[PDB]
Design a protein around this ligand. Structure first.
Ligand SMILES: OC[C@H]1O[C@H](O[C@@H]2[C@H](O)[C@@H](O)O[C@H](CO)[C@H]2O)[C@@H](O)[C@@H](O)[C@@H]1O
Ligand SMILES: OC[C@H]1O[C@H](O[C@@H]2[C@H](O)[C@@H](O)O[C@H](CO)[C@H]2O)[C@@H](O)[C@@H](O)[C@@H]1O
Ligand SMILES: OC[C@H]1O[C@H](O[C@@H]2[C@H](O)[C@@H](O)O[C@H](CO)[C@H]2O)[C@@H](O)[C@@H](O)[C@@H]1O
Ligand SMILES: OC[C@H]1O[C@H](O[C@@H]2[C@H](O)[C@@H](O)O[C@H](CO)[C@H]2O)[C@@H](O)[C@@H](O)[C@@H]1O
Ligand SMILES: OC[C@H]1O[C@H](O[C@@H]2[C@H](O)[C@@H](O)O[C@H](CO)[C@H]2O)[C@@H](O)[C@@H](O)[C@@H]1O
Ligand SMILES: OC[C@H]1O[C@H](O[C@@H]2[C@H](O)[C@@H](O)O[C@H](CO)[C@H]2O)[C@@H](O)[C@@H](O)[C@@H]1O
Ligand SMILES: OC[C@H]1O[C@H](O[C@@H]2[C@H](O)[C@@H](O)O[C@H](CO)[C@H]2O)[C@@H](O)[C@@H](O)[C@@H]1O
Ligand SMILES: OC[C@H]1O[C@H](O[C@@H]2[C@H](O)[C@@H](O)O[C@H](CO)[C@H]2O)[C@@H](O)[C@@H](O)[C@@H]1O
Ligand SMILES: OC[C@H]1O[C@H](O[C@@H]2[C@H](O)[C@@H](O)O[C@H](CO)[C@H]2O)[C@@H](O)[C@@H](O)[C@@H]1O
Ligand SMILES: OC[C@H]1O[C@H](O[C@@H]2[C@H](O)[C@@H](O)O[C@H](CO)[C@H]2O)[C@@H](O)[C@@H](O)[C@@H]1O
Ligand SMILES: OC[C@H]1O[C@H](O[C@@H]2[C@H](O)[C@@H](O)O[C@H](CO)[C@H]2O)[C@@H](O)[C@@H](O)[C@@H]1O
Ligand SMILES: OC[C@H]1O[C@H](O[C@@H]2[C@H](O)[C@@H](O)O[C@H](CO)[C@H]2O)[C@@H](O)[C@@H](O)[C@@H]1O
Lengths: 109, 109, 109, 109
C-alpha cells in the first residue's frame, strides 16, 4: 500500500511501499523512509521506547504514539475534522493532503 | 497507478486502477468507473466528441477537455493554487484531496 | 495479486488482477478474463452450479471444482509433483509455469 | 514489477520489487536481495566491474553479464528453448519457473 488513510494506523513493523521506497514504523520506535538500503529521512526517535505506532488522524495530524499512548512526534497539522491521506509518492516524497474537496460517492463497506 | 497527481493528465484510453476497480478516460469521451464489468459512475459525456483527455489541475479542479481544448465536464473545485491528488481508493470511492499540509521534502526529479 | 501459487485457491468472487485486466472465479461458477468491461476468455461453465472454487494444484493442474468437490474444467497439465504458478501477465495472457528450476532459498513465514 | 520474463533484462540500477523486498542489479555489478535495509542474498560479484546487466534467457538460464558481454554468474538452469519467469515472491523467495505448460492465448501487443 502507498497510502495511510485518516482513521488508520501502522503497527510496529508495518509500512507503506512504492517501488524501491519503504516508509516503516520500526520496532525501535523510529519512523524511517528508505531508498532500498539507504535511510533518507527519519523522526529520530529510535531507542526512546519499544513498539510504537503511527496514526493518521481525522483532525489532519500525523502522530507517533508510545506504548503508553503518549505522543513522541507529530507533523503539527491538526485542524478541522475531515478526511485526509498520507501518501508515499512515486517521486519519493511523503505528503499529507486534505481535506476531501469532491468525491464520486461510490464507497462500499 | 491509483493516483492522478495535479499537473498530470489521462490521455484517451488511459486509466487508474486498484484491484478489481478501473477509472478510465474512454475514447468515446465518457469518464467511467467500473467494478470489473459493471459501470457504477460516469460523467455521461459519451458520444459528445472523440478522444478527450482528463486533467487534474494545480487549481484543484478535475476537468474533461474536448479535442479542441474546451471543457465538457468539471468537478467545480477550482480554487487556491497548490498540490492536489485524485485517488481511486481501495474502498471504491474516487476522491480529490488537497492542498498539501506537510511533507518530508525528499522528492527527486 | 497477479499470481495464484500451487497449493492456493480462489474462492467464489476472488480474483487475480493486473492493470486493466481481471481474472475472476465468479459466483455463477464461470471463470472469466476481462479487459476492463469486456470478456475475452472463459471456461464457459456459467449456470452449471453456484459457488465454485479454482485450485492451482501441486501436480501442475489448474482445476475448477463444484460445491460437491467434482471437477467441471481443467487445464489438463497434471504431472510430476512440485511447485507451479498461474500468472495473469502484463501482456494480457494467463499462463501456467513449472516446475521450479532454481531458487535463492530465502523464503520465510 | 515482481517478474522478469524470459527475453527481458535488468539494466544497471533496475530492479524487481514486492512489498518490503527489492531484488536489484546494482551499478557495482552485485545482484542483491534486500529485506528493507538488510541484504539477505547476493551473487557476491560486487567490485568485479561496473554497469553489469541481468538476463532471463529463453533457454531458462538466469545470467549476470559484464560490460564486455561475458558471464560472471549464472543459475545453471539452461535447457530447452521456451518461456520462463524469474519471480520475486510474496514469501521473500526468488524463483525460476518453466517452461509454459498451458495458456489462454489472449496475449496482445
Ligand atoms: O539500530 C538497529 C536498527 O538499525 C536500523 O534502523 C536505524 C535506527 O533506527 C537509527 O540508528 O536511525 C537510522 C536512520 O537514521 C535507522 O536506519 C534498522 O536496520 C533497524 O531494523 C534496526 O533495528
Ligand atoms: O485535539 C483532538 C485530538 O487530540 C489528540 O491528538 C492530538 C492532536 O492531534 C494535536 O493537538 O497534537 C497532539 C500531538 O502533538 C495529538 O496527540 C487525539 O486524541 C485525537 O484523536 C483528537 O482528535
Ligand atoms: O466524502 C469523501 C469520503 O468518503 C468516505 O467517507 C465517508 C465520509 O467521511 C462521510 O460523509 O460519512 C461516511 C459514513 O461514515 C464515510 O464513509 C470515504 O471513502 C473517505 O475515504 C472519503 O474521503
Ligand atoms: O458504446 C460503446 C462503449 O460502451 C462502453 O462504454 C459505455 C458508454 O460510454 C456509455 O453508453 O455509458 C456507459 C456507462 O454508463 C459505458 O459503459 C465501453 O465498452 C466502451 O469501450 C465502448 O466504446
Ligand atoms: O482559472 C485558472 C484556470 O483556468 C482553466 O481551468 C478552468 C478553471 O479550473 C475553472 O474556473 O473551471 C473551468 C472548467 O469549468 C476550467 O477550464 C485552465 O486554463 C487552468 O490551467 C487555469 O489554472
Ligand atoms: O510540498 C509538497 C509537494 O512537493 C513536491 O512539489 C514541489 C512543490 O510544489 C514546490 O515547493 O516546488 C517544487 C519545485 O517546483 C515542487 O517539486 C511534490 O513532491 C508534490 O507532489 C508535493 O505535493
Ligand atoms: O448476469 C450473470 C453474470 O453476467 C456476467 O458474467 C457472464 C456470465 O458468466 C456468462 O453469460 O458468460 C460471460 C462470459 O462469456 C460472463 O461475462 C457477470 O456480470 C457476472 O457478474 C454475472 O453474474
Ligand atoms: O492425481 C492426483 C490428483 O488428483 C486430483 O486432481 C486431479 C488430477 O489433477 C488430474 O488427473 O485431473 C483431474 C481433473 O480432470 C483432477 O481432479 C486431486 O485430488 C489432487 O489433489 C491430486 O493431486
Ligand atoms: O524451492 C522453491 C520453492 O520454495 C518454497 O517451497 C518450498 C519447497 O517446495 C520445499 O523444498 O519444501 C518447503 C516446505 O514444504 C516449501 O516451502 C516456496 O517459496 C515455493 O514458492 C518455491 O517454488
Ligand atoms: O557502498 C557500495 C555499495 O554498498 C551496498 O551494496 C553492497 C555491496 O554490493 C557489497 O559490499 O555486498 C553487499 C551485499 O553482501 C551489498 O549490500 C549498496 O549500498 C550499494 O548501493 C553501494 O554501491
Ligand atoms: O547455449 C545457448 C545460449 O548461450 C548463451 O548463454 C549461455 C547458456 O545459457 C549456458 O550454457 O550458460 C552460460 C553461462 O554460464 C550462458 O552464457 C547465450 O548466448 C544465449 O543467448 C544462448 O541461448
Ligand atoms: O504460450 C505462452 C507464451 O505466450 C506468449 O509468447 C508467445 C509464445 O512464446 C509463441 O507461441 O510465439 C509468440 C510469438 O513469438 C510468443 O508471443 C507470451 O505471453 C509468453 O509470456 C507466454 O509464456
Amino acid at each position: 500500500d502507498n497510502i495511510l488513510y485518516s482513521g488508520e494506523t501502522l503497527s510496529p513493523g508495518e509500512f507503506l511501499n512504492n517501488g524501491r521506497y519503504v516508509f516503516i514504523m520500526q520496532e525501535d520506535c523510529n519512523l524511517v523512509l528508505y531508498d532500498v538500503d539507504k535511510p533518507i529521512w527519519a523522526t529520530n526517535t529510535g531507542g526512546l521506547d519499544r513498539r510504537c505506532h503511527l496514526s493518521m488522524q481525522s483532525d489532519g495530524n500525523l502522530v507517533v504514539y508510545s506504548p503508553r499512548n503518549n505522543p513522541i512526534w507529530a507533523s503539527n497539522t491538526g485542524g478541522e475534522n475531515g478526511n485526509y491521506v498520507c501518501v508515499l509518492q512515486k517521486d519519493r516524497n511523503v505528503v499529507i493532503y486534505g481535506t476531501a474537496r469532491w468525491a464520486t460517492g461510490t464507497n462500499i463497506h
